[PDB]
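Fill-in record for Ribose ABC transporter, substrate binding protein.
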Amino acid sequence: GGGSAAGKKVVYSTFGAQIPFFNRIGEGAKAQATVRRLDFDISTSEIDPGKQIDSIDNAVAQQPDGLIVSPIDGSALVPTIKGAVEDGVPVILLADGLSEDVGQLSFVGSDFAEIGRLKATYIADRLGDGGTVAMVNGTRGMSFVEEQGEAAREVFEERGIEIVDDVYTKAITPDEGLTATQNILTRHSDVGAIYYSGDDGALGGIRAIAARNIAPGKIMVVGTDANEGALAAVRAGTMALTVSQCAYEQGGIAIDVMADYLETGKKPDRRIFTPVIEIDTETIDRVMSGAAWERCEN
């Protein structure tokens, strides 16, 4: 060979200075970029599609050897990222994808269908004999929501678990979770489990359950993100399961993919599913002191 990634200029275009998940991806990418000896910048735009587009358009005009993008919106960004590709910049999509294939080198990020099956299986293994489930989904049509949800419905079918309410909400927020859950419980107060697209939804659900004076853990609540409130709820027994999408590892993997391509010219797999880790009341402390957890979140 004799090729090298050392010195190559790569840029990561992300958004949301305040969002913990993207902050953590930036950190894992930064750390690995140092290891691979890249000239590496992160550009972080305002939470707005138009702003991310200028930021990308702009990075493309500095002729980087590679571009990594976590896209704020999967369809509005298509023309721009397609533009970067046709301009010969290898592009990796990171954590979230686009609405159509634009010739990216790869899409690195979680398998949202796998997240759904893990959650649904957890509930299926644990539910009493006539036990039933409700689903509190986030925004209708969002890939994160829909892909995990269809995977979960398939598990519930296959395991014989009746879904008594299957609702979509405005977004994944505690307030949205709380309202949806309180309505569900007025209609189906004996539900055995409630699936939430995301943790903040679930954190709202937990408050709804408690307001009804239902005992903690009598209804199994499952979410995704492994955020700090979720980890505490799982530890306390008020939530049963959450799932980490391993933001820190995602960032490292994207850098490794790009640096290996810049070094060898060999094309990577165009879809690279990144590790996810389930955290439940029984396993959380063991899991979290392990090496896989440290690679996953640092």
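KEY FINDING: Residues 99-298 form a domain with the Rossmann fold fold (CATH 3.40.50.2300).
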